[PDB]
């Protein structure tokens, strides 16, 4: 669902399974807790952006069926989510280093300007610097290095 | 600090930083170092058995080195200065910071 | 100038890697392979079928 | 069988989203999406669905 | 030429401070770096040499370049000014290796934070989403143990815009205009300033028990202290369960602490579980002192 | 389709030159090829005379003019080459007869 | 850390055990004579079986093929021009070209075309 | 069987703590195990889970760290120790010093860090010493005179 | 031996793993006699190793990896303290099992040719142990029953620790460092050091020292830590080859010694063969010795 850029459908899909598990009468309470905990924990591991993480966190902590679980399970889930967090943050910062490596992988002048115009590289770096994904000192140096290398 | 400005900072970006609620402090030892005062100033004389020029009878230099310094800082000399220049392009010398001695 | 040889160096990198990687393959292994090559002679025989079977321009050839 | 096929399809599709940061096509896309979707707080959005929770079908039938 | 340049290139360090362009030095060859310099990485020696280089240049402004040498006999490091044509000047300085190693270790300790590692973290706040949180403390409690009690305090108290985390001075309470991050910062400050100092002193009495029993007691003590500002309310019943008369346990239901939390809420069941387990532990070990 | 047609005409020009086809056979082929593209363009859009279709027609015109120009020069080169070869062949026989 | 190599160690345990089993399997063997014939025969059958078993998306391929052909054609034609200074053909041809074209400042022509470049068809109609 | 697992997520997915504790304590109650051999068993698992949880966070610093300084600043180890740990990791990934060293050098070069390239070069030029002992003149010869290098 | 070691590791008992390691490292001695340079050669130049050594190397690697998998580095280093130098060098250099024999063969005849530099008379600074190495996981003894019996230093508190435990840990680290320095000096003087450097030498020394450590129980919290001296044969002096009995037997002597001299922080043990005597003495930092001393005959100890 989220591959198409629609988070609401993903939330609806998660709720559909949670509510389908909740109302079944052929399983015991401990199995209901086990399945719900496993699915909720697994859901965080598949988020591909920091906005989806926040949306899912907001949805989960407001669901009534999650408020009545034992304390030792709520604490475990809360501790587990915070680990996939800061990791989905580190990846978004390493992405810029990967992009810079790809840019630097070219060795001839004509194709460099044909593929990576300077006015777009500068904008891409400065937009990330603005959003506090990179510190100013590691963005200005990156711009300067490319500016010197091209000359 | 002054030695961590070279870190990339790709873990815990600036978006996710906060001040800690307690003050840290490193674990260094309380030691200084101080220059000694009673050590002698040892130097060896290697000009006694050779012809040499004494100035103001310390710093030790050579004749072809001293002469150039005189011409450069010699704006108050009769235009002698050309002779000094010609000689400078042609021993041991001792003064009892070279640019200020002259 | 160092920057003139960048393309040559990039092309030369690939030669070294597969030179070492081909050697590693042989150490990890053989009779069955030899048989296949002998069967390949059939393709030469199959290609041997075709092989075994084997107004100014006209005036110029005649003149020659 | 279908699960394996779906995994393969998603793996093959992720390759373009990987290069989205420098591919030119992903500038026409993600512009068309915004033009066809005339300060969104994601946390607020999730709570609305959570509060309704598991009574969704019941409250609309 | 390439061989010599590669040999020389490994021993070059670019000291930073003193002027523009800094300064350039070539370290001498040593048997093993760990005995003299105290580390095998040049990035620490470059930072450590700054004070010595700055002092040396301050004493002798006329010096243009600096050379470094090592005297093994007296375990000494020597600086000297140099002239062109491989000639040497008259300026000289001396520094023992012990204080240099001490300074290097001091810089490394500051870099690594005494070896305890980083302490940055995150929190899940209902509605507001993720926020930053620092788990540092002045008592030495490891990160994942500090994060244990806060995840229960948050799961019990909750969060609302008009009440925040329900902290009950001006800098410890939420104002109408505060953002959730500011409220979380005040909550952490209030914790560190008014909870741990009253809970830590009472942990010296429970070192006979296994580790996980102490860990369980820690959460209960923190929870009680947060809601009552006094850790003596529940330690009394803990002592009664461990050594006192077990028949007095059921009288806990008459205390205000129980009444405020509800007669059948999860909070009270969690409290009774600990006391029910302590009695079993006491029974299984008749020799407990 | 436009890009394919543009290259097809130029590629066919030399193929026709090498076979010694007369200009009429090239002109009829050019007209027949243009007619198919023009008819096909009637469904792939209204062909309403606006700026984009005007530019399309402008490109189509030069796509024909260039090949029509090149066809003449190719034959012009070929004729001179053949004339030189024939003149050399004519000179060989004179020496043969002189020796005989 | 010591606990982040546990998975690698666990996966690497299985490599050593197999390496020991092969030694014993080969040492327990003159059955090699019988063993070889099986592969020697199966290879031929396997080889025989293998021998027995032995819009826009079209316009794009046509464009690619024709582009390759055009590049090839421009090659093998540039070569004759390369010899212009020596051949005397491309001299006898240049004579005719000049003689027929007589029936300049290059920069002037470019400006003249550019001044009305993007409106030729509009002006013509 | 419980201790046979080595990763954190599957451990909690398969063996929840609240069930392990109950299983051990029920057996202790029925006098199948003495208290001292049940409490120690519970404590060992309780400590091991925290140890693995800590190690999982330290792995990320090595995985994503861009230089030695910020890798050390995360795990808290000294620079000399993280250098050796990285050496071991990339030697395990590459199956030897040459393969691991080449990849480490490539990473350092592409990331624009001299420190990582230095440690890679150390391995690369430590492996090369094996070439000094070969007797080039007495290598076995092919039927056509071509030597047979190992 | 491999199966016995696996049983000991999975059952969380050090005693069984010790006897398994004894067999495992007793078998390995067969590798010292092979003439690597004169092995028969294949038509393509590949040597022809006997099947007896392949199944020994493949089991040594499996045992080492199994020991490391459980998080028990103490008994993994203890295993490498009896194998020949080339085998120790090969194992620690992670390599595919198919090439371990070739690596060992090359290393053996590289050593035989004198391509390794001699070690100095003083142990390198890089061989010492520091806090960074403690954080790295050394002193981890793996699974166990008591909390005091899964850390080689014998400290109990593992969740909440006071400064008193920190002082004891600091003293015990220096004690272990002094023991390692003495072992290295003794080995160097006899001219029996192995052909290793850096981390390999550190692991060798740690494994040598690890076998002689005993954690006496009584006297205070955290008990006490002692390193037994080397003896010709244990059965004549101590009366038994198992440390679990000596640990219980030393309790009275250690308690009395600590009662007589409260100011003593650490205790050292030594053996005097001439008079068949055991000696206790207090020790200070910097390898300096105190004035307190005690003497006990061996007969009553046995």
Numbering used by the authors:
A (entry chain K): 202 to 352
B (entry chain D): 224 to 280, 288 to 309, 311 to 321, 356 to 361, 367 to 372
C (entry chain M): 1 to 29, 31 to 55, 93 to 102
D (entry chain S): 103 to 140, 146 to 168
E (entry chain J): 604 to 771, 783 to 903
F (entry chain E): 102 to 201
G (entry chain T): 1 to 29, 32 to 56, 93 to 141, 147 to 168
H (entry chain J): 303 to 452
Q: Can you list sentences taken from the study reporting this PDB entry?
A:
Podophages that infect gram-negative bacteria, such as Pectobacterium pathogen ΦM1, encode tail assemblies too short to extend across the complex gram-negative cell wall. To overcome this, podophages encode a large protein complex (ejectosome) packaged inside the viral capsid and correspondingly ejected during infection to form a transient channel that spans the periplasmic space. Here, we report a near-complete atomic model of the bacteriophage ΦM1.
Here, we describe the ejectosome of bacteriophage ΦM1 to a resolution of 3.32 Å by single-particle cryo-electron microscopy (cryo-EM). Similar to that of bacteriophage T7, the ΦM1 ejectosome is encoded as a three-protein mega complex composed of TEP, OEP, and EP3 oligomers arranged coaxially within the phage capsid. The capsid houses a large ejectosome complex composed of TEPs (, gp48), octameric ejection proteins (OEPs, gp49), and ejection protein 3 (EP3, gp50) arranged axially above the crown of the portal complex (gp35). The EP3 octamer adapts the locally 8-fold symmetric interface of the ejectosome to the 12-fold symmetric crown of the portal by intercalating the EP3 helix α-2 between the crown domains of adjacent portal monomers, forming contacts with the C-terminal portal helix. Through a combination of BLASTP and DALI homology searches, putative enzymatic domains were identified in the ejectosome, specifically a lysozyme-like domain within the OEP (Gly718–Ser903) and an endolysin/exotransglycosidase-like domain within the TEP (Asp268–Asp528). Viral lysozymes and exotransglycosidases can digest peptidoglycan, suggesting that these domains may degrade local peptidoglycan surrounding the periplasmic channel once ejected from the phage particle during infection. The T7 ejectosome adapts by slipping around a pedestal-like barrel created by the portal crown, whereas the ΦM1 ejectosome adapts on top of the portal through intercalating helices which form an analogous barrel. In T7, the TEP consists of an N-terminal LTase followed by the hub domain. However, in ΦM1, the helical hoop and endolysin-like domain are inserted into the hub domain. Further, the ΦM1 OEP has an additional lysozyme-like domain which T7 lacks.
